[PDB]
mmCIF file of C-alpha atoms and ligand atoms in Angstrom:
data_model
loop_
_atom_site.group_PDB
_atom_site.id
_atom_site.type_symbol
_atom_site.label_atom_id
_atom_site.label_comp_id
_atom_site.label_asym_id
_atom_site.label_seq_id
_atom_site.Cartn_x
_atom_site.Cartn_y
_atom_site.Cartn_z
ATOM 1 C CA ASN A 2 270.690 98.391 -35.650
ATOM 2 C CA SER A 3 268.267 96.951 -33.096
ATOM 3 C CA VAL A 4 269.078 94.219 -30.593
ATOM 4 C CA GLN A 5 266.717 91.879 -32.469
ATOM 5 C CA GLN A 6 268.456 92.587 -35.759
ATOM 6 C CA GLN A 7 271.798 91.964 -34.089
ATOM 7 C CA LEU A 8 270.660 88.606 -32.696
ATOM 8 C CA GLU A 9 269.188 87.511 -36.015
ATOM 9 C CA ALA A 10 272.462 88.433 -37.715
ATOM 10 C CA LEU A 11 274.436 86.506 -35.123
ATOM 11 C CA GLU A 12 272.287 83.462 -35.765
ATOM 12 C CA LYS A 13 272.626 83.872 -39.557
ATOM 13 C CA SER A 14 276.450 83.869 -39.213
ATOM 14 C CA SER A 15 276.448 81.018 -36.690
ATOM 15 C CA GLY A 16 275.589 77.998 -38.844
ATOM 16 C CA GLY A 17 273.086 76.925 -36.218
ATOM 17 C CA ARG A 18 270.188 77.883 -34.062
ATOM 18 C CA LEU A 19 270.436 80.479 -31.294
ATOM 19 C CA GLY A 20 268.036 80.914 -28.382
ATOM 20 C CA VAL A 21 268.258 83.908 -26.073
ATOM 21 C CA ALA A 22 266.160 85.128 -23.189
ATOM 22 C CA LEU A 23 267.274 88.079 -21.085
ATOM 23 C CA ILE A 24 265.140 89.335 -18.223
ATOM 24 C CA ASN A 25 266.070 92.779 -16.918
ATOM 25 C CA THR A 26 264.854 92.805 -13.349
ATOM 26 C CA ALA A 27 264.989 96.654 -13.223
ATOM 27 C CA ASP A 28 261.670 96.776 -15.089
ATOM 28 C CA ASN A 29 260.838 93.160 -15.908
ATOM 29 C CA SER A 30 261.592 93.900 -19.597
ATOM 30 C CA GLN A 31 262.859 91.112 -21.847
ATOM 31 C CA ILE A 32 265.059 90.540 -24.873
ATOM 32 C CA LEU A 33 263.695 87.324 -26.524
ATOM 33 C CA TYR A 34 264.932 85.271 -29.502
ATOM 34 C CA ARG A 35 263.373 81.851 -30.274
ATOM 35 C CA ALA A 36 262.524 81.982 -26.592
ATOM 36 C CA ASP A 37 259.507 79.666 -26.868
ATOM 37 C CA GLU A 38 261.387 77.069 -28.866
ATOM 38 C CA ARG A 39 262.775 73.971 -27.323
ATOM 39 C CA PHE A 40 266.486 73.249 -26.960
ATOM 40 C CA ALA A 41 268.295 70.389 -25.267
ATOM 41 C CA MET A 42 269.411 71.703 -21.860
ATOM 42 C CA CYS A 43 272.396 69.407 -21.562
ATOM 43 C CA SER A 44 274.158 70.029 -18.243
ATOM 44 C CA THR A 45 272.244 73.250 -17.585
ATOM 45 C CA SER A 46 269.560 70.869 -16.244
ATOM 46 C CA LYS A 47 271.820 70.269 -13.212
ATOM 47 C CA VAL A 48 270.577 73.536 -11.699
ATOM 48 C CA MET A 49 267.085 72.064 -11.454
ATOM 49 C CA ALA A 50 268.302 68.825 -9.827
ATOM 50 C CA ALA A 51 270.457 70.653 -7.281
ATOM 51 C CA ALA A 52 267.597 73.062 -6.516
ATOM 52 C CA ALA A 53 265.187 70.141 -5.993
ATOM 53 C CA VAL A 54 267.512 68.772 -3.314
ATOM 54 C CA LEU A 55 267.789 72.244 -1.764
ATOM 55 C CA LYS A 56 263.984 72.386 -1.632
ATOM 56 C CA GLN A 57 263.904 69.037 0.234
ATOM 57 C CA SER A 58 266.515 70.371 2.660
ATOM 58 C CA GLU A 59 264.118 73.123 3.758
ATOM 59 C CA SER A 60 262.188 70.453 5.706
ATOM 60 C CA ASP A 61 265.066 68.124 6.614
ATOM 61 C CA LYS A 62 267.890 69.812 8.509
ATOM 62 C CA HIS A 63 270.191 66.761 8.125
ATOM 63 C CA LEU A 64 269.812 66.354 4.386
ATOM 64 C CA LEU A 65 272.683 68.432 3.021
ATOM 65 C CA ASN A 66 275.157 66.615 5.276
ATOM 66 C CA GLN A 67 273.778 63.189 4.386
ATOM 67 C CA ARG A 68 276.576 60.815 3.209
ATOM 68 C CA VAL A 69 276.383 59.278 -0.222
ATOM 69 C CA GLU A 70 278.659 56.341 -1.060
ATOM 70 C CA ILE A 71 280.667 56.776 -4.270
ATOM 71 C CA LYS A 72 281.575 53.548 -6.083
ATOM 72 C CA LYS A 73 283.690 52.872 -9.170
ATOM 73 C CA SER A 74 280.506 51.792 -10.990
ATOM 74 C CA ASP A 75 279.078 55.306 -10.501
ATOM 75 C CA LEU A 76 281.718 56.887 -12.730
ATOM 76 C CA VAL A 77 280.555 57.900 -16.191
ATOM 77 C CA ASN A 78 282.101 60.023 -18.979
ATOM 78 C CA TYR A 79 283.148 63.115 -16.960
ATOM 79 C CA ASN A 80 283.488 63.097 -13.174
ATOM 80 C CA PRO A 81 286.572 64.977 -12.012
ATOM 81 C CA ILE A 82 285.323 65.394 -8.452
ATOM 82 C CA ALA A 83 283.528 62.100 -7.836
ATOM 83 C CA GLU A 84 286.522 60.114 -9.028
ATOM 84 C CA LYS A 85 288.536 61.557 -6.112
ATOM 85 C CA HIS A 86 286.033 60.023 -3.720
ATOM 86 C CA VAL A 87 285.584 56.483 -5.003
ATOM 87 C CA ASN A 88 285.347 54.079 -2.052
ATOM 88 C CA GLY A 89 284.497 57.023 0.225
ATOM 89 C CA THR A 90 281.501 59.302 0.655
ATOM 90 C CA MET A 91 280.426 62.762 -0.419
ATOM 91 C CA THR A 92 277.607 64.693 1.219
ATOM 92 C CA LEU A 93 274.569 65.790 -0.780
ATOM 93 C CA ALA A 94 275.859 69.378 -0.441
ATOM 94 C CA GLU A 95 279.241 68.315 -1.848
ATOM 95 C CA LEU A 96 277.425 66.582 -4.725
ATOM 96 C CA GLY A 97 275.430 69.770 -5.412
ATOM 97 C CA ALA A 98 278.679 71.759 -5.456
ATOM 98 C CA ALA A 99 280.432 69.276 -7.735
ATOM 99 C CA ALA A 100 277.505 69.043 -10.146
ATOM 100 C CA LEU A 101 277.177 72.812 -10.422
ATOM 101 C CA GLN A 102 280.742 74.078 -10.180
ATOM 102 C CA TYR A 103 282.556 71.344 -12.141
ATOM 103 C CA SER A 104 279.657 69.793 -14.110
ATOM 104 C CA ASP A 105 280.480 66.452 -12.555
ATOM 105 C CA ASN A 106 278.115 63.981 -14.244
ATOM 106 C CA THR A 107 278.390 61.375 -11.497
ATOM 107 C CA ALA A 108 277.356 64.041 -8.996
ATOM 108 C CA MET A 109 274.293 64.860 -11.127
ATOM 109 C CA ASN A 110 273.366 61.176 -11.188
ATOM 110 C CA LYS A 111 273.614 60.924 -7.404
ATOM 111 C CA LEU A 112 271.273 63.887 -7.060
ATOM 112 C CA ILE A 113 268.785 62.358 -9.490
ATOM 113 C CA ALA A 114 268.949 58.980 -7.744
ATOM 114 C CA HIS A 115 268.436 60.602 -4.376
ATOM 115 C CA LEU A 116 265.327 62.407 -5.690
ATOM 116 C CA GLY A 117 263.932 59.191 -7.203
ATOM 117 C CA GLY A 118 264.578 59.663 -10.928
ATOM 118 C CA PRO A 119 264.483 62.232 -13.716
ATOM 119 C CA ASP A 120 260.697 62.597 -13.488
ATOM 120 C CA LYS A 121 261.092 63.911 -9.915
ATOM 121 C CA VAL A 122 263.223 66.749 -11.290
ATOM 122 C CA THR A 123 260.416 67.502 -13.758
ATOM 123 C CA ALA A 124 257.900 67.516 -10.890
ATOM 124 C CA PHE A 125 260.083 69.997 -9.002
ATOM 125 C CA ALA A 126 260.217 72.322 -12.017
ATOM 126 C CA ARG A 127 256.436 72.091 -12.332
ATOM 127 C CA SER A 128 256.100 72.991 -8.623
ATOM 128 C CA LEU A 129 257.800 76.297 -9.523
ATOM 129 C CA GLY A 130 255.242 76.935 -12.284
ATOM 130 C CA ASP A 131 257.554 75.833 -15.104
ATOM 131 C CA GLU A 132 255.354 73.906 -17.514
ATOM 132 C CA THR A 133 258.102 73.623 -20.101
ATOM 133 C CA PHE A 134 261.116 71.932 -18.464
ATOM 134 C CA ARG A 135 261.395 68.154 -18.724
ATOM 135 C CA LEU A 136 264.116 65.808 -17.526
ATOM 136 C CA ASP A 137 263.923 62.332 -19.032
ATOM 137 C CA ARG A 138 267.352 60.738 -18.641
ATOM 138 C CA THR A 139 270.383 60.536 -16.409
ATOM 139 C CA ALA A 140 273.912 61.593 -17.402
ATOM 140 C CA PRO A 141 275.534 61.178 -19.862
ATOM 141 C CA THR A 142 272.611 60.406 -22.167
ATOM 142 C CA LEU A 143 270.631 63.535 -21.236
ATOM 143 C CA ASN A 144 273.199 65.424 -23.422
ATOM 144 C CA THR A 145 272.554 63.657 -26.777
ATOM 145 C CA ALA A 146 270.853 66.881 -27.949
ATOM 146 C CA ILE A 147 269.304 65.368 -31.062
ATOM 147 C CA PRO A 148 267.440 67.965 -33.164
ATOM 148 C CA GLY A 149 263.697 67.753 -32.561
ATOM 149 C CA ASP A 150 264.039 65.306 -29.656
ATOM 150 C CA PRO A 151 261.842 66.623 -26.808
ATOM 151 C CA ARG A 152 263.710 64.705 -24.095
ATOM 152 C CA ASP A 153 265.681 66.821 -21.624
ATOM 153 C CA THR A 154 264.561 70.118 -23.173
ATOM 154 C CA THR A 155 263.198 73.478 -22.195
ATOM 155 C CA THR A 156 262.827 76.909 -23.817
ATOM 156 C CA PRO A 157 265.090 79.922 -23.195
ATOM 157 C CA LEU A 158 262.216 81.945 -21.719
ATOM 158 C CA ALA A 159 261.007 79.164 -19.431
ATOM 159 C CA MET A 160 264.543 78.618 -18.157
ATOM 160 C CA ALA A 161 265.183 82.352 -17.661
ATOM 161 C CA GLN A 162 261.934 82.702 -15.709
ATOM 162 C CA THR A 163 262.718 79.683 -13.554
ATOM 163 C CA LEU A 164 266.332 80.668 -13.014
ATOM 164 C CA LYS A 165 265.122 84.118 -11.871
ATOM 165 C CA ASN A 166 262.658 82.462 -9.493
ATOM 166 C CA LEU A 167 265.345 80.144 -8.151
ATOM 167 C CA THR A 168 268.090 82.691 -7.612
ATOM 168 C CA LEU A 169 266.317 86.005 -6.971
ATOM 169 C CA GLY A 170 262.714 85.057 -6.433
ATOM 170 C CA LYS A 171 260.200 82.934 -4.724
ATOM 171 C CA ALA A 172 261.267 79.316 -5.399
ATOM 172 C CA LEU A 173 263.487 78.535 -2.409
ATOM 173 C CA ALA A 174 263.668 79.600 1.226
ATOM 174 C CA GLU A 175 266.364 82.187 1.894
ATOM 175 C CA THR A 176 269.161 79.959 3.144
ATOM 176 C CA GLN A 177 268.694 77.601 0.227
ATOM 177 C CA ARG A 178 268.406 80.413 -2.335
ATOM 178 C CA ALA A 179 271.654 81.847 -0.997
ATOM 179 C CA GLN A 180 273.323 78.433 -1.233
ATOM 180 C CA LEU A 181 272.265 78.038 -4.863
ATOM 181 C CA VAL A 182 273.616 81.505 -5.659
ATOM 182 C CA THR A 183 276.901 80.760 -3.900
ATOM 183 C CA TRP A 184 277.257 77.598 -5.973
ATOM 184 C CA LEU A 185 276.517 79.334 -9.276
ATOM 185 C CA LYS A 186 278.887 82.239 -8.527
ATOM 186 C CA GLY A 187 281.693 79.723 -7.851
ATOM 187 C CA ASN A 188 281.227 77.917 -11.175
ATOM 188 C CA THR A 189 284.570 77.028 -12.799
ATOM 189 C CA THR A 190 283.335 76.005 -16.259
ATOM 190 C CA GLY A 191 281.934 79.237 -17.697
ATOM 191 C CA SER A 192 284.946 81.509 -18.387
ATOM 192 C CA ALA A 193 284.573 81.462 -22.159
ATOM 193 C CA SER A 194 280.771 81.596 -22.324
ATOM 194 C CA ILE A 195 278.409 84.352 -21.074
ATOM 195 C CA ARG A 196 281.107 85.711 -18.736
ATOM 196 C CA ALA A 197 283.438 86.420 -21.679
ATOM 197 C CA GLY A 198 280.872 88.797 -23.194
ATOM 198 C CA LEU A 199 280.541 90.904 -20.032
ATOM 199 C CA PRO A 200 282.681 93.356 -18.085
ATOM 200 C CA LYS A 201 285.302 91.347 -16.177
ATOM 201 C CA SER A 202 284.352 92.808 -12.806
ATOM 202 C CA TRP A 203 280.600 92.046 -13.017
ATOM 203 C CA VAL A 204 279.616 89.344 -10.603
ATOM 204 C CA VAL A 205 278.079 86.352 -12.386
ATOM 205 C CA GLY A 206 276.652 83.003 -11.402
ATOM 206 C CA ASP A 207 276.169 80.501 -14.223
ATOM 207 C CA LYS A 208 275.806 76.905 -15.296
ATOM 208 C CA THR A 209 277.066 75.712 -18.680
ATOM 209 C CA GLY A 210 276.165 72.696 -20.778
ATOM 210 C CA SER A 211 277.552 70.994 -23.824
ATOM 211 C CA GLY A 212 276.422 68.056 -25.870
ATOM 212 C CA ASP A 213 276.279 66.516 -29.309
ATOM 213 C CA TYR A 214 275.102 68.605 -32.271
ATOM 214 C CA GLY A 215 277.610 71.169 -31.048
ATOM 215 C CA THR A 216 275.064 72.093 -28.398
ATOM 216 C CA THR A 217 276.543 74.849 -26.294
ATOM 217 C CA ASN A 218 274.555 76.402 -23.489
ATOM 218 C CA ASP A 219 274.892 78.740 -20.507
ATOM 219 C CA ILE A 220 272.364 80.106 -18.036
ATOM 220 C CA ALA A 221 273.380 83.005 -15.825
ATOM 221 C CA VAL A 222 272.435 85.550 -13.237
ATOM 222 C CA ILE A 223 274.374 88.757 -13.637
ATOM 223 C CA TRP A 224 274.866 91.500 -11.038
ATOM 224 C CA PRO A 225 276.009 94.795 -12.607
ATOM 225 C CA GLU A 226 277.809 97.298 -10.360
ATOM 226 C CA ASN A 227 275.122 100.038 -10.657
ATOM 227 C CA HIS A 228 272.031 98.212 -11.959
ATOM 228 C CA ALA A 229 269.495 95.592 -10.995
ATOM 229 C CA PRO A 230 270.326 91.976 -11.911
ATOM 230 C CA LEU A 231 269.909 90.462 -15.341
ATOM 231 C CA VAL A 232 268.979 86.840 -15.945
ATOM 232 C CA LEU A 233 270.294 85.468 -19.216
ATOM 233 C CA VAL A 234 269.851 82.154 -21.024
ATOM 234 C CA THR A 235 271.899 81.532 -24.176
ATOM 235 C CA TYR A 236 271.290 78.187 -25.908
ATOM 236 C CA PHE A 237 272.921 77.194 -29.187
ATOM 237 C CA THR A 238 272.734 74.064 -31.299
ATOM 238 C CA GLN A 239 273.879 72.931 -34.712
ATOM 239 C CA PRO A 240 272.614 70.633 -37.463
ATOM 240 C CA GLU A 241 275.485 68.123 -37.537
ATOM 241 C CA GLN A 242 276.041 65.555 -34.783
ATOM 242 C CA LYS A 243 279.777 66.043 -34.411
ATOM 243 C CA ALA A 244 279.796 69.864 -34.695
ATOM 244 C CA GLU A 245 282.297 71.645 -32.481
ATOM 245 C CA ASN A 246 280.919 73.387 -29.450
ATOM 246 C CA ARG A 247 280.790 77.203 -29.797
ATOM 247 C CA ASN A 248 281.136 79.046 -26.506
ATOM 248 C CA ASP A 249 282.196 82.121 -28.469
ATOM 249 C CA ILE A 250 278.652 82.438 -29.833
ATOM 250 C CA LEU A 251 277.326 82.590 -26.269
ATOM 251 C CA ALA A 252 279.855 85.273 -25.347
ATOM 252 C CA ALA A 253 278.889 87.228 -28.476
ATOM 253 C CA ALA A 254 275.174 86.977 -27.696
ATOM 254 C CA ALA A 255 275.805 88.119 -24.111
ATOM 255 C CA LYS A 256 277.761 91.149 -25.368
ATOM 256 C CA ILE A 257 274.924 92.087 -27.751
ATOM 257 C CA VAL A 258 272.105 91.918 -25.205
ATOM 258 C CA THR A 259 273.897 93.539 -22.256
ATOM 259 C CA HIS A 260 275.086 96.560 -24.237
ATOM 260 C CA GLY A 261 274.264 99.778 -22.392
ATOM 261 C CA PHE A 262 273.594 98.029 -19.059
HETATM 262 C C1 CAZ B 1 276.779 68.622 -19.569
HETATM 263 O O1 CAZ B 1 276.450 69.345 -20.503
HETATM 264 C C2 CAZ B 1 277.826 67.549 -19.651
HETATM 265 N N1 CAZ B 1 278.080 67.224 -21.069
HETATM 266 C C3 CAZ B 1 278.458 65.983 -21.402
HETATM 267 O O2 CAZ B 1 278.627 65.058 -20.605
HETATM 268 C C4 CAZ B 1 278.654 65.712 -22.893
HETATM 269 N N2 CAZ B 1 279.709 66.244 -23.485
HETATM 270 O O3 CAZ B 1 280.376 67.259 -22.864
HETATM 271 C C5 CAZ B 1 281.772 67.271 -23.134
HETATM 272 C C6 CAZ B 1 282.446 65.978 -22.640
HETATM 273 C C7 CAZ B 1 282.418 68.493 -22.483
HETATM 274 C C8 CAZ B 1 281.895 67.429 -24.648
HETATM 275 O O4 CAZ B 1 282.803 66.778 -25.232
HETATM 276 O O5 CAZ B 1 281.062 68.203 -25.191
HETATM 277 C C9 CAZ B 1 277.980 64.655 -23.541
HETATM 278 C C10 CAZ B 1 277.337 63.644 -22.925
HETATM 279 S S1 CAZ B 1 276.620 62.583 -24.068
HETATM 280 C C11 CAZ B 1 277.195 63.537 -25.360
HETATM 281 N N3 CAZ B 1 276.981 63.270 -26.651
HETATM 282 N N4 CAZ B 1 277.900 64.584 -24.914
HETATM 283 C C12 CAZ B 1 279.007 68.134 -18.877
HETATM 284 N N5 CAZ B 1 279.046 69.579 -19.139
HETATM 285 C C13 CAZ B 1 280.131 70.318 -19.210
HETATM 286 C C14 CAZ B 1 279.796 71.767 -19.390
HETATM 287 O O6 CAZ B 1 280.067 72.280 -20.476
HETATM 288 O O7 CAZ B 1 279.216 72.329 -18.458
HETATM 289 C C15 CAZ B 1 281.375 69.868 -18.741
HETATM 290 C C16 CAZ B 1 282.341 70.740 -18.279
HETATM 291 C C17 CAZ B 1 281.621 68.440 -18.339
HETATM 292 S S2 CAZ B 1 280.563 67.280 -19.225
#
């Protein structure tokens, strides 16, 4: 059956709500499912915060190497990199890397604080023409993912469009675009998500997120061996607060929409 029928069936089996946007950059075609509906981004929002700092670095050649003091009081619920550096410093570049490649929540908070608060991340998204994205809170509370709560949400299509702009398009100057792509390609947290639904040897950059309501997300740029890149957002959320996260659904969605590519 059709891709749309396959996605609807996946959602029907899932016990939740699935959002997919794939952009095929060969022809700008799209595979869209609930793509204009809002989902909690959870830690996928870290891409926007890191990119906002990269944008600033365009016009400040010392920014990425700027020291940031890490204190015990900065630690939150999940901070495997920052905790190694308590009482020392990390650079803004190191905080970008930690936020993106390990989903270090303390690192995300340092980026947000540097920028001047969640609303500055929203303003950066808007500067890229993304009217949908909003960041409202710091970590960990940006991951509460309560159904119908607009805070810290976007739509799959808005995020796919912005991720394409960030990684392959016009958002960032070249050195900064390349840095973002390097970070995403080196992600350690995404093995079981979009990547698991794709050929093992395809190059992928991604950022995952997970929150309450079993909210399980991944946003990716995918480089096939013989085809133009694909940009893929897979968001998934469930009705019950303490639902298990479901990375397998993201892998399954990725397999469905990349068939034939
Ligand atoms: C981003 O999504 C972050 N998520 C969280 O901090 C929340 N939970 O995530 C973990 C701890 C993995 C979970 O048990 O689901 C969270 C904060 S408030 C709330 N109700 N939940 C980070 N993201 C990931 C990721 O999947 O990318 C992590 C690897 C580290 S936490």
